[PDB]
Amino acid sequence: GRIASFLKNAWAKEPVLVASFAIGGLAIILPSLSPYTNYAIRINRATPYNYPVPLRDDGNMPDVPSHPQDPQGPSLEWLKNL
Amino acid sequence: MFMINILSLIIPILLAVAFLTLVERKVLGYMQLRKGPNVVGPYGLLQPIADALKLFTKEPLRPATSSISMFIIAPILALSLALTMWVPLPMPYPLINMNLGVLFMLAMSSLAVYSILWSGWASNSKYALIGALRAVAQTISYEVTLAIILLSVLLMNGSYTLSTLITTQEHIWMIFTSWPLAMMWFISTLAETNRAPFDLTEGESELVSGFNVEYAAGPFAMFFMAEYANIIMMNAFTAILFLGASHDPHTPELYTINFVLKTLALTITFLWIRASYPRFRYDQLMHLLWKSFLPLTLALCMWHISLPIMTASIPPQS
Amino acid sequence: TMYIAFILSTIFVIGFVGFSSKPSPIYGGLGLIVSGGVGCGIVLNFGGSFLGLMVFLIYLGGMLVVFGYTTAMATEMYPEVWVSNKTVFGAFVSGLMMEFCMVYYALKEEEVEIIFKFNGLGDWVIYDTGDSGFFSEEAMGIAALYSYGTWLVIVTGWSLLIGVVVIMEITRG
Amino acid sequence: PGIVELPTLEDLKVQEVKVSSSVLKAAAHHYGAQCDKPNKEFMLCRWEEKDPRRCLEEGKLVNQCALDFFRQIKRHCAEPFTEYWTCIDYSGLQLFRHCRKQQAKFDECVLDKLGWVRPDLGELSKVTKVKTDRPLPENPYHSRARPEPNPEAEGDLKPAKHGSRLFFWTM
Amino acid sequence: MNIMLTLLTNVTLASLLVLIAFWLPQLNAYSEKTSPYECGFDPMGSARLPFSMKFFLVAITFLLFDLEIALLLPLPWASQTNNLKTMLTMALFLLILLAASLAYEWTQKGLEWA
Amino acid sequence: PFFDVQKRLGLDLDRWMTIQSAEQPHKIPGRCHAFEKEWIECAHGIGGIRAEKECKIEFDDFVECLLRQKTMKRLSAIKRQRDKLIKEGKYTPPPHHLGKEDPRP
Amino acid sequence: MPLVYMNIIMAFAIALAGLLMYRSHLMSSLLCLEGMMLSLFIMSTLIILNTHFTLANMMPIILLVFAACEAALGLSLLVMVSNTYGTDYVQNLNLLQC
Amino acid sequence: SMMKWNRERRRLQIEDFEARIALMPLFQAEKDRRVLQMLRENLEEEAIIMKDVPDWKVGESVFHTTRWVTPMMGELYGLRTNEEILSATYGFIWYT
Amino acid sequence: MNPIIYTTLIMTVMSGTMLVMISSHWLLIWIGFEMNLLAMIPVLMKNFNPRATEAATKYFLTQATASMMLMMAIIINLLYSGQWTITKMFNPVAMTMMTMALAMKLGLSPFHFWVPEVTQGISLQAGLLLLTWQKLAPLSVLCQISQSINPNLMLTMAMLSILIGGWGGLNQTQLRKIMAYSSIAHMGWMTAVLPYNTTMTILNLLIYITMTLAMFMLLIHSSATTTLSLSHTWNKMPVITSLMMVTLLSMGGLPPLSGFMPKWMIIQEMTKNESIIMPTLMAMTALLNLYFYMRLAYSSSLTMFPSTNNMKMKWQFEHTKQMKLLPTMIVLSTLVLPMTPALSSLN
């Protein structure tokens, strides 16, 4: 009732502010309600800005990939299909 | 060879300004049922040369009440900065490739304002002082919105490098992504160059001639050249930012032509606006830029910050 | 060209003398303009592109509002220049002489100790030989303001808002 | 203080890889996969010794393996590789997306003649284990002896002998 | 040094234009011609008299708005961080505070002149 | 009155920018990371009074890294002696120092 | 120290001396304040860049922010003095003695 | 459309970074060898330049620690030609 | 000024002081100082008068100069140490500059000139905040760096502050100026023991804060700003002027009143460090402060002055505003001497 009258009056007298608050409101709410924000984070972590310094192999590192391109290690196959 | 490049970026720009004067006159005439300069040379092509020769053969007067040093420094600063703001422009390859060419353009424009300020202040006339204060008020109104819109539209670029704008728009013009920001940026560029509905610093019908009322012959020609060079440069900035053009690395001419045509279209629209609307009142200009653009620029800045994160489309840093 | 930074710093001192002698605030404005531009040049020469352009941009915008006021509050029927008053000219000349004396003492005498110990060699010496890679280290450190410096962002934003409030409260009568 | 020990001019002489940056970038993806073993050992040395003079020998083995990498290219994929890096050399950014057609030619020959497979996306940036035999440095920083810490506390607390001994206050 | 060369060339060209402007034409100067222009009549007062700013508050706040624009410039690089949640929250916080300052100035009749 | 609320509540408001040896974005090391690390680890927990005199070698190395005053003094002495030798013709700069030999990659 | 550090410190000293030595206007004192702020910015920026203190590269921006905050404070005080006295002359600030 | 293009550009940037990583060890080796050679040349010429000066130990460390300290620009190109000094110092900054 | 806006400004002043007293980074301490100044200027100018504007301008200029010097000292300390932590400053020149800046912020002589003017210009409500709360942050900073403070400079500043405060207080008939000079003398007393024992500085600060809160609240409760105006208060409210006399006697440092605690403990600590001339001179110079306090006590309560006829109407009405902390502040500032061994809690 009162909200509808206020919004109709707002968009009839000051339509500029109505759009700005709507656009500003979406910019705060939508990022939280999105499944791609985590992908945006992962992409930033994925980019290798600095050298991947190797670690000395003590023989007890099963998952650490002592190799050029053997299967062990993180994969960017998710980004390829994005 | 670099000096040759400097000359090939300055002299053609001055010729373009000279002929843009004629183009503006003829466009205004034909939009006013008139004919632009048509006697001096074929189709008026020799009018700019006549104007330049007249101005530089005209006696320049030094006002008795004027501070000579600033009165002479102002025109130099105006032209030098107008010619310098073309250095970083990517067409397709920039003369000087800066990682932050955009902020360089912003700083160069901010300095150019002092030309109008000092020219007005040093002129030591009431109309010139009014023109200088109007320039101050104008730059108060547009600078924040200009910077915010530029930041928001560059958030999809990944950096302030101007050359990267060509790559970002390799499949689509960026105006299809930020057309409200495009409109507001266009109006801000109109206000910045003291141009259509914002010709308040000069105010022909209200301030006789504004800040340059006491300027004659050469210095007046330099201020006019600086004004029109800023017009062309700002329209070029609008072209590269929103109206991206295809660039074949082996045939740069393709981009150059597309770029030039888009800049010419934007300048023609500048003249079109000049001959279609009445002049604002600078109170109304400041109120518009502070109460209709600025809130919307802030909202769209929020939107263009949140959008790449919420869509996982953050542009690359390099 | 191996002493570009030193020349720019001397121009910095010259501009500081220029607006420190207190001419008309209009002329102090261009003094500060020159000082800010030359400082931007120095910072650019040291690798601070964003920082130097930032001081250039902000002071360029700030001195504009000062100029607006100089014509509204500090407007003297006869504005004074550096060669208009013997006090202003004396201050300007004294500053220039001090700068020239210290520059000469620093250059001709390699090691100079006025208050700190200054070395007469070129500023190029202190530069590092490291490689930043695909980085603009200044830009990354500055952008870390929103990730690392959340507290700084909060305090600065609060101070700016309170500054707006304070300006409105002061200029209300 | 002391004299900075410096290796002689002779012992830091290697057969340099006299190729261009564009040439290196064109073969970079295959170079990382084939010359992985000696390059990673040198990186581990530099990042554990923290002294360039303690890894010159490993640095020499990097160039030797790098030269051997290009020798195979010259013998099996000379012409297609020359086409590839010439295209890359043209662009000022040395982009990979303006020469994908030439890249496929170079990969195809190399996959057949030499059997190399180009690493996929996100594979040259992974952290690897390096199995070396050089001992792990005990004091890479050449740190001095840490000063002895102050004595640490004591047993339980008891009330002050006569309370606060402040002038005339008995409590 | 190339940017310095460009600046030098532009400044020299402008100053050469000034020199040609002030030394090519035939000069004939007298007191009346160089007098200040006041639409044909003599000015009453000096042009160096105080000129009141009816938008002084707007300028003083434009100072802080330019400050906030300086704070917002590093944003394109700030999006390259791994802490996108914190970065986004802080950026939106700065923008919200800017909007709040603008709103406070607007409602308390600060953007109005006189 | 340093009310150390950060150490009490566990918050980290400004301890992340107090030193250049702390964590920095993209692991960009400080120019004197090693010297500052040595100085801090030497002078950890022993108190300021002891740290001033005991861990003084580390602090001197850190200051020399930061300002390079003594290194600049040595370089200036070398330059002055070389200039004096050249004036008297007692020395001839080698071709690799005269821009005659190609620098190694 | 390098000579550029000496020049910047001398510039700060000159600006401080200028601020401490008023002549007539309050605007010039604010100019000297802004000059000192600029000199401090340049000093801090050179120090941070030279030592590659990456995380401290945001310090000069904060310094600049509070610098122009103080400038706005000064400008507002200036307008109030002009409104209350007609001129920004520092001699009008004379009611409060001792 | 901009989302698709930006994701593709991120993939391209990752590929270029991987190429840089692959090329990095050779560049590090060349850099350390060049730095050591320049230091040795400077030491050798210093031993001749300041042999007459009393008490001037050649190659004397300025730090107390017996650890590698990355040399400054003046410690590598101190006695090189002015053109080389200007290049190695201001080349990247002045290149545009 | 809107009450909400005034509360926000007061909370911003308090948050600036808490930022100074809470951070471990020099940049944040400088930021807190800047916020304190920014939120203090409008609080100084809550009641718009030309005198208020003059006080605000002078305070802003002085604090701006002090903050610039402090930031220069911080930058020099960073240059010579590469450190931002609040610790033993590693440069003597930076230490001297920082000491000058902090003394200017506190108002220690010869940086005392602005205090009597700014205090007189602003109202009693703002004067109380200026003379009590604005001393917390610089004193805390000085207490954190007391190890690196050059004792000679601090002692000279303290002795000059005491001398000048006493001398200035003698020629003053305006109550606010008397309070300002007394504040200068007490700041000198506090800073005298900074190089020796900071807990004594904290104790003196607490006692001075209580005494000044009591005095300013009594002045507000009497609405008196001059000796003549305060003299009339004996007729309407003798209790207020009697309590004012007691508090003045306490401020003089007369036993058994609480004002003897800080001077006694300061003399003790300074004699423990073999300094016997300086505490003796300070004690002797406190007699000037005791003199002007006694003169005020005479004009206010000990002797009765002529009132005016219109006080008869004022006799009928009772004060509406009620300061709840005034009795506690009066008691704590007069009758806490039997409780000195509580000094340990400040450790």
From Swiss-Prot, chain B:
- List the keywords (alphabetical): Electron transport, Membrane, Mitochondrion, Mitochondrion inner membrane, NAD, Respiratory chain, Translocase, Transmembrane, Transmembrane helix, Transport, Ubiquinone
Where located?
Answer: Mitochondrion inner membrane
Chief location: mitochondrion
What EC number(s) does this enzyme carry? 7.1.1.2
Q: Does the record carry Ligase as a key word?
A: no
Q: Does the keyword Hydrolase apply?
A: no
Give the first-level EC class, as a single word. Answer: translocase
Q: Which gene encodes it?
A: MT-ND1
Q: Which family does the record claim for this protein?
A: Belongs to the complex I subunit 1 family.
Q: Which residues form a coiled coil?
A: none
In this UniProt entry, which cysteines form S-S bonds? none
Cross-referenced InterPro entries: NADH_UbQ_OxRdtase_su1/FPO (IPR001694), NADH_UbQ_OxRdtase_su1_CS (IPR018086)
Role of this protein: Core subunit of the mitochondrial membrane respiratory chain NADH dehydrogenase (Complex I) which catalyzes electron transfer from NADH through the respiratory chain, using ubiquinone as an electron acceptor. Essential for the catalytic activity and assembly of complex I.
Q: Which protein is depicted?
A: NADH-ubiquinone oxidoreductase chain 1
HAMAP family, per the entry: NDH1_NuoH (MF_01350)
Q: How does it assemble?
A: Core subunit of respiratory chain NADH dehydrogenase (Complex I) which is composed of 45 different subunits.
| Transmembrane domains' residue ranges | 2-22, 68-88, 100-120, 146-166, 171-191, 223-243, 253-273, 294-314
- Superkingdom assignment: Eukaryota
Record-linked PANTHER family: NADH DEHYDROGENASE SUBUNIT 1 (PTHR11432), NADH-UBIQUINONE OXIDOREDUCTASE CHAIN 1 (PTHR11432:SF3)
What Pfam family is a match for this entry?
NADHdh
Catalysed reaction equations from the record: a ubiquinone + NADH + 5 H(+)(in) = a ubiquinol + NAD(+) + 4 H(+)(out)
Q: GO CC terms on record?
A: mitochondrial inner membrane; respiratory chain complex I
Q: What GO molecular function terms would the record report?
A: NADH dehydrogenase (ubiquinone) activity
| Topology versus the membrane | Multi-pass membrane protein
From Swiss-Prot, chain E:
The annotated topology with respect to the bilayer is:
Multi-pass membrane protein
Segments passing through the bilayer: 3-23, 55-75, 86-106
> Does the keyword Protease belong to this entry?
no
> Which GO terms label this protein's molecular function in UniProt?
NADH dehydrogenase (ubiquinone) activity
Under catalytic activity, the entry for this protein gives:
a ubiquinone + NADH + 5 H(+)(in) = a ubiquinol + NAD(+) + 4 H(+)(out)
UniProt keyword annotation of Transmembrane helix present: yes
Q: Name one GO cellular component term.
A: respiratory chain complex I
Primary location recorded for the protein, binned into one broad class = mitochondrion
Q: What InterPro entries does UniProt report for this protein, alphabetically?
A: NADH_UbQ/plastoQ_OxRdtase_su3, NDAH_ubi_oxred_su3_sf
Keywords of the record, alphabetical order, are: Electron transport, Membrane, Mitochondrion, Mitochondrion inner membrane, NAD, Respiratory chain, Translocase, Transmembrane, Transmembrane helix, Transport, Ubiquinone
Instruction: Provide the protein's localization.
Output: Mitochondrion inner membrane
**Domain of life assignment:** Eukaryota
Q: Which GO terms describe its biological process?
A: mitochondrial electron transport, NADH to ubiquinone
The EC number on file is 7.1.1.2
Q: Which family does it belong to?
A: Belongs to the complex I subunit 3 family.
What is the recorded function of this protein according to its Swiss-Prot or TrEMBL entry?
Core subunit of the mitochondrial membrane respiratory chain NADH dehydrogenase (Complex I) which catalyzes electron transfer from NADH through the respiratory chain, using ubiquinone as an electron acceptor. Essential for the catalytic activity of complex I.
Assembly, in brief, is: Core subunit of respiratory chain NADH dehydrogenase (Complex I) which is composed of 45 different subunits. Interacts with TMEM186. Interacts with TMEM242.
Q: What is this protein called?
A: NADH-ubiquinone oxidoreductase chain 3
The organism encoding this protein is: Sus scrofa
Q: What gene name is listed for this protein?
A: MT-ND3
UniProtKB/Swiss-Prot annotation, chain G:
What is a single molecular function from GO for this protein?
NADH dehydrogenase (ubiquinone) activity
UniProt main location, coarse = mitochondrion
Q: Which domain of life is it from?
A: Eukaryota
Q: How does it sit in the membrane?
A: Multi-pass membrane protein
Q: Which reaction does it catalyse?
A: a ubiquinone + NADH + 5 H(+)(in) = a ubiquinol + NAD(+) + 4 H(+)(out)
Q: What keywords appear on the UniProt entry?
A: Electron transport, Membrane, Mitochondrion, Mitochondrion inner membrane, NAD, Respiratory chain, Translocase, Transmembrane, Transmembrane helix, Transport, Ubiquinone
Q: Which GO terms describe its cellular component?
A: mitochondrial inner membrane; respiratory chain complex I
Tell me how this protein assembles.
Core subunit of respiratory chain NADH dehydrogenase (Complex I) which is composed of 45 different subunits.
Q: What family does this chain come from, according to its entry?
A: Belongs to the complex I subunit 4L family.
Q: What is this protein called?
A: NADH-ubiquinone oxidoreductase chain 4L
Curated annotation (Swiss-Prot), chain I:
Q: List cystine links.
A: none
Q: Where in the cell is it found?
A: Mitochondrion inner membrane
Entry keyword Transmembrane: yes
Cite the entry's keywords alphabetically.
Electron transport, Membrane, Mitochondrion, Mitochondrion inner membrane, NAD, Respiratory chain, Translocase, Transmembrane, Transmembrane helix, Transport, Ubiquinone
Q: Which superkingdom? A: Eukaryota
Q: How does it sit in the membrane?
A: Multi-pass membrane protein
**EC number(s) on file:** 7.1.1.2
Enzyme category, top tier = translocase
GO terms assigned for molecular function:
NADH dehydrogenase (ubiquinone) activity
**Keyword Electron transport appears in the UniProt entry:** yes
| TM ranges | 3-23, 25-45, 59-79, 89-109, 149-169, 178-198, 200-220, 237-257, 274-294, 325-345
Pfam families the UniProt entry points to = NADH_dehy_S2_C (PF06444), Proton_antipo_M (PF00361)
What InterPro entries does the database record attribute to this sequence? Complex_I_Subunit_2 (IPR050175), NADH_DH_su2_C (IPR010933), NADH_UbQ_OxRdtase_chain2 (IPR003917), ND/Mrp_TM (IPR001750)
Q: What catalytic activity does the UniProt entry give for this protein?
A: a ubiquinone + NADH + 5 H(+)(in) = a ubiquinol + NAD(+) + 4 H(+)(out)
Task: Name the Gene Ontology biological process terms.
Answer: mitochondrial electron transport, NADH to ubiquinone; mitochondrial respiratory chain complex I assembly; reactive oxygen species metabolic process
Entry's Gene Ontology cellular component terms: mitochondrial inner membrane; respiratory chain complex I
Whom does it interact with, and what assembly results? Answer: Core subunit of respiratory chain NADH dehydrogenase (Complex I) which is composed of 45 different subunits. Interacts with TMEM242.
Q: What does this protein do?
A: Core subunit of the mitochondrial membrane respiratory chain NADH dehydrogenase (Complex I) which catalyzes electron transfer from NADH through the respiratory chain, using ubiquinone as an electron acceptor. Essential for the catalytic activity and assembly of complex I.
From which source organism is this entry? Sus scrofa (Pig)
Q: List the gene name.
A: MT-ND2
